[PDB]
Amino acid sequence: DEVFNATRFASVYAWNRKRISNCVADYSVLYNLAPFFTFKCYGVSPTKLNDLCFTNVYADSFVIRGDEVRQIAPGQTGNIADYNYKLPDDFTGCVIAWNSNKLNYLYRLFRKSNLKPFERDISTEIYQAGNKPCNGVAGFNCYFPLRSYSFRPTYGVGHQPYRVVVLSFELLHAPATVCGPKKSTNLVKNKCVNFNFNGLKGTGVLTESNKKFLPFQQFGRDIADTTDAVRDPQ
């Protein structure tokens, strides 16, 4: 509710990153028909999203023009993509964008070079555009790199406000703290029983072990690269 009902999002050039951890992330709440027009997820099917556990969930929200939503996709290049916000090609997350035309925003349009993915460039250094290395705040060839969007309410789709929230989640590879709501049952040992350990699925004889783990480790693997030893939650 603080990332969707906030009514005040950050500027694109200054996308705030919020960490979500140690809770239950039921995605069924954000399925309203009127918002969430685009739900393009990369690497995870939108239907199979609730029944998965994630360990690194970060939510960055910003307001950009609706015509520039295309640039947010990985691999695309543009003024927003190259100078304001960049996403890696190997991206695993869902980009939800909804129109907010009914409901000051600064975007950077001048930069020496395109930024690496997941970087913030919040600085008011004057971008020179001439032979003269002017350090003044303003000048003929000296231009400020930040300007307000000044969204036009009359405009229908072009140059319209468009809130964008990105949920970059890392797939389960470590002790996870965010997972969907699923009932937990009592473990059964020394019996061939189907199990579901933090999203991992399979069948086997669950037995105790004398192996010693480490605080940053959660799964053991064998020569065949299969989940051999798993420490149960709770």
């Epitope: 555009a129 001439g130 032979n131 303003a138 003929f140 060839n141 000296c142 231009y143």
Partner: antibody, heavy 114, light 98 residues
Framework: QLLESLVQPGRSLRLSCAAS????????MHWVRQPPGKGLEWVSG????????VYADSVKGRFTISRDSAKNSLHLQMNSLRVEDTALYYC???????????????????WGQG | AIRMTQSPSRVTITCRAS??????LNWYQQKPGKAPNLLIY???SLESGVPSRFSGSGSGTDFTLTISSLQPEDFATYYC?????????FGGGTKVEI
């Protein structure tokens, strides 16, 4: 639309170039003098970003330029007009600063009408 | 300051500068009854709407405006102007003759 508006050595005529269509305070409107039978010559230069102003270095002090956002003009003031200085003056708009790289403001464009 | 004098007086026009301008030039076409228009930016580019027949090449102290086949209704004057440093100085000026 950059619509704009003598023999005696001493004059104080005011030259103003009205602006239409494009939005003022976004580029660098400049004034260029073109004597008949000869080429162009930049004489005046304004700045949207700041109040810094550069004139032609052929003669200093005589050239003066100003800005006015409400009426979208420059209102160039000319004092002690030379007999040979008589020419058909042009008001030109600078290219979009979003281009960046090489000097956008120094690059003339449109060159007014008439 | 910066001074130029275009050497000319498939038409190629070259304006030479004393100092190393390094691609800070513009090529301007002025119709006899109209205001001058933009043809080449950054000494090598084409503005929107300009026909592709015009072309600008060269950098440093050598530049060339090449118009291929001498397309008609192009008798207007051609000017060479630099943006390297103030003051803004135009070239000598040359119009194609037929």
């Amino acid at each position: 639309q950059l619509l704009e508006s003598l023999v005696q050595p001493g004059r104080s005529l005011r030259l103003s170039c009205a602006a239409s269509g494009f939005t003022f305070d976004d580029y660098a409107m400049h004034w260029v003098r073109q004597p008949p039978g000869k080429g162009l010559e930049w004489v005046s230069g304004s700045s949207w970003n700041s109040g810094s102003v550069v004139y032609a270095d052929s003669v200093k002090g005589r050239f003066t330029i100003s800005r006015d956002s409400a009426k979208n003009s420059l209102h160039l003031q000319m004092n002690s007009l030379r007999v040979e200085d008589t020419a058909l003056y042009y008001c030109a708009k600078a290219v979009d600063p979003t281009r960046g790289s090489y000097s956008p403001d120094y690059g003339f464009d449109i060159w007014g009408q008439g | 300051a910066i001074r130029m004098t275009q050497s000319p007086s498939r038409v190629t026009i070259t304006c030479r500068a004393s100092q190393s301008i390094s691609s800070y030039l513009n090529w301007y076409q002025q119709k006899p009854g109209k205001a001058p228009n933009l043809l080449i930016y950054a000494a090598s580019s084409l503005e929107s709407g300009v026909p592709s027949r015009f072309s600008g090449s060269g950098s440093g102290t050598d530049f060339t405006l090449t118009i291929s086949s001498l397309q008609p209704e192009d008798f207007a004057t051609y000017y060479c102007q630099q943006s390297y440093s103030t003051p803004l100085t135009f070239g000598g000026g040359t119009k194609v003759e037929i």
